[model samples]
Target chain A: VETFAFQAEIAQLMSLIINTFYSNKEIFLRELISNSSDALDKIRYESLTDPSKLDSGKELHINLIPNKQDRTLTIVDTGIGMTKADLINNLGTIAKSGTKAFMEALQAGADISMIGQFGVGFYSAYLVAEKVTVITKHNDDEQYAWESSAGGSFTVRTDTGEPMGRGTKVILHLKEDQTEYLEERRIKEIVKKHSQFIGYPITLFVE
Target chain B: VETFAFQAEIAQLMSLIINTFYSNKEIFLRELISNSSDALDKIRYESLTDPSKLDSGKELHINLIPNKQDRTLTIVDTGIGMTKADLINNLGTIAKSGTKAFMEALQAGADISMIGQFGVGFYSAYLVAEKVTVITKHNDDEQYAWESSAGGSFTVRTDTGEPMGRGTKVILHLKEDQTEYLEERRIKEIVKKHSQFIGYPITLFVE
Candidate 1:
């Protein structure tokens, strides 16, 4: 496992995300689902030319697996998965300019329209999760796992578990206080509010 | 005439300040006035021990200068001024933790109590000014001027214009759209609303 520190901006942006979104914690669901939609969109375009991209037989959709017994909420998408390098670049470093714009709008009390515009939207998972693990496989790259507790650093390694085929699985180890997110009714309400219009079918696995 | 780039975090923070604070432009005055109050508090506490700190003959008060012809507003404070190194450290590098907290509070739509808690309160000037020039004289060090347009960099130079004695003077070249800050009534309202209880007497020059 190779551990890496978040860039200076990401570390700063993470704290802001966790703090500023406290009142609107449910937005975490919207942000993650939107990311999955984007991933699905990307792979759809790619698979049109590269038929091999869909060899895994996974349909283009989003999955919400809330495991109450294990205290975890996993949002999985059969979309364009990230390579190890993509994980580092996309999840590690953020566009300082975008986060800054979002923060300023918050201060001004303006209705912000685009939290998903920046890649840091992924960090919103930290709002409800004590630790997050990402199991992903790209069409070109082998499967890998990325894990972080929103601390000083995160870890990435070759995935030893069953093959994920071509998709991204985000397993959020829900914080004790954030168990409200584990409730199926609560999850459905959030998805309905923020991501009702999402193109992909978001299935909530119960039991 | 040496120029230095704003630390990456600050450049990002500046754009947010300018964009987000568009509706509440008057808060710029409140923020600057509060900073002067803090400086006054600092110098007063220090003067109790070091009598020589008050040798400059400037009383513990704040001055507001509005120049219609020059299109500038200057806030002068006879407080603990910053040295060249202090300018770089205090105004340049910010505590990411404090800013992150402030941004989070802003995002959560919480009633933010502390803009001055983090040093970035100084950057709020960019909201009203196209360019800002800071002339500060510390007790132990010579006078210096720090100037910036909130672009990529800022400049610091010896204050050859005049000896500021022992205080800090911030001159704002007001943006064309922000001339309302120069209005005596507007400035008074902001001071009354925010800095009315401040210990230091805030004086506004009508002319």
Candidate 2:
């Protein structure tokens, strides 16, 4: 297992971003789902360079699984995943991902009316999740799991089992105060608001 | 009495300014006192160049008198008084003074920090006063009184025979909802908060 520390000022920046930037906390689900759609887009773009890279024969999609008993919500995307190095570089630092370049490209008169901006969307997950685990497998590297409590530290480890098909899964351990995020109806409403226009199929599983 | 209509957009601008820019209602007193200080400064500057410009040898000061029974507050300033033209130009228009230049001077390190930067100081009186009356006498001009409800128009005419030496007096007919401004303690507190560092003395009368 590998551990990483977040930048010192990230905590203060996160507090301001989570508490003040978003007027409605319910939008957290919308942001997460929007991020899933972007991940699918990334994979689809890569598939164009090498058609054989498309391991999942099914169309790009997102799945939201709500576990009421566990008070958790798992958002799974069959899209591009991160290697161990990619995990540290992308999630350890805020807004350090190529997300900025992607967003700038989309905003530069691209046909991205359907895609919401990136960087901000992922951090919005912390608004609801007390703890989060990201399980991912890259086409080029071994599968890995990255975990964080949204505090100032995170852990990354190699998965014990065989690699799942190229994809990413985000498990959100919702706090007691954020049980609304575990509601099927609430999550569905948020998805419809922010990602309904996304060029991919999205499904929600309630149990 | 002479009356003039405010422009169509004045009402909207007034509402926006009152609700947005002036975050604290207590700022109303500061704005009024600042206007009074500016008038005093103008007279003092004139007196320096022309001794005949000042009628009395009284030092520059602000006197605030509050009447609980009538719910009225009067603020008198020993400053440059207004003629009929001054009343019409200052009170009737939004951009009567070169407010842009005034703000530029303030930003350009002008020593006039005690004076308000914006030209809307007089209108700010409407924030606390339901009706306002200004009586003044310029050293070379005849005395005049300007009265306004601040709804859409105002009245200006020669002061009947009120003994106003060589300065301006502002009488605020406080609204029932704003009777607190007519209290000596409350008005004094507000003055000290915003104008305590003012060079001129500000005295409050209890009645």
Candidate 3:
């Protein structure tokens, strides 16, 4: 696994993410689910154009897989996966285009620029997770894994493991103090708070 | 009356617009109204930080102004206005970044890629109007006017007239075949269909 440094400004952005969202960190799950929703919507829309896009035939939906013993929560979405370049641009960089605007809004004390809208809310995972692992596969690209602990750098590597057809799986290693996110009831509550109306089914695995 | 050519691909996009929406042209009003709704949300969010941003004292709201004698309909919003550059980029260009994704989705016969989501739905104005004129003022920029007939190009110029503070007024010169949009009942129905729960008030002028 090769480590990559985050965009030079991401360290400051990580601190701002915590400070701006400290009072509403539960929204971290909301941001995650919303990103999954957009991804699901993208693949569904893509498949409509090219039938081969659906050859894998994984039903479109999101899964909340919680492992209580492991103290981890995984969000899986059967949607368009990201390429390595996409991972670098979308996740490694903080708000690819709107970081300046977001900082201005924050400095002005306005609550307008929701980080999710700018595509950087992925970092909000840091609020509750000590580490995050993204195992993703795009039909056009090979399966790859991205892991980060918000330590100003992330690592990515090609995975030679069995392919999961197509989609993305995001595993969050819960912080010792943030294990509540691994509870089914807590996950459902936050899902309803932000994604109740999402068209895709969000199922929480039990047992 | 200087004219600027649309991005080269917009001609093809215009035809696609007519064909894709022929069955639901009434959504033209819905698209216009939704755009106004977002602009209103932006200015309100902006004012939360700097109270002076609301110094103009225009309560955030939307207005439907119909002129039967002139065969025109105007949608106005007391929200963040746009600069001349914003007009050229947002309205003059089709889908700024997602045109390829949107076209691929459309070609696949999917019902996804609602043009409004990509910021190009403003052109949906052409479905019901022969001409569209935007009079707008951003707080940090001078007032400007953009007028387009969708006949392959548009025009933009500075406005020295009295300002309506900060906001945008979109006047649609209703096409003769689409005069129904100028009626009070038709306007109300479309607003409820799309923006009934929008936090800001939407008022239709009677006198």
lDDT of 2 by residue, B24-102 (tens): 5666678778778667756765565367776554577889888887778888888887767667755422332224334
Question: Candidate 1's error at A177, in angstroms?
Answer: 31
Best candidate according to DockQ = 3
What's the true lDDT of residue A206 in model 2? Answer: 59
Q: By summed lDDT, which 10 consecutive residues of candidate 2 chain A come out lowest?
A: A110-119
In the range A115-198, model 3's lDDT, one tens digit per residue, is: 664446777887888889998888888899998887688889997776878888889998898888888788889887666555
lDDT of 1 by residue, A54-94 (tens): 88755989999999899999999999888777787644223
- Evaluate model 3 with DockQ and give the value: 0.05
Worst 10 residues of 1 chain A by lDDT: A110-119
Tell me each candidate's TM-score. 0.49, 0.44, 0.56
Q: Candidate 3 residues B1-207, lDDT tens each?
A: 457887656655665665454756677777777777667656665564467888865587888999999999999888888877767765423252345545654565544336654446777787778888999988888889898777678898887766788888999998888888888898888877665545467899974
Runs with alpha carbons beyond 4 Å of true place in candidate 2: A1-207, B8-11, B15-23, B92-116
iRMS for model 2? 26.7
lDDT of 1 at B128: 85
What is the RMSD, in Å, between candidate 1 and the native fold over all Cα? 15.9
Per lDDT, what order, best first?
1, 3, 2
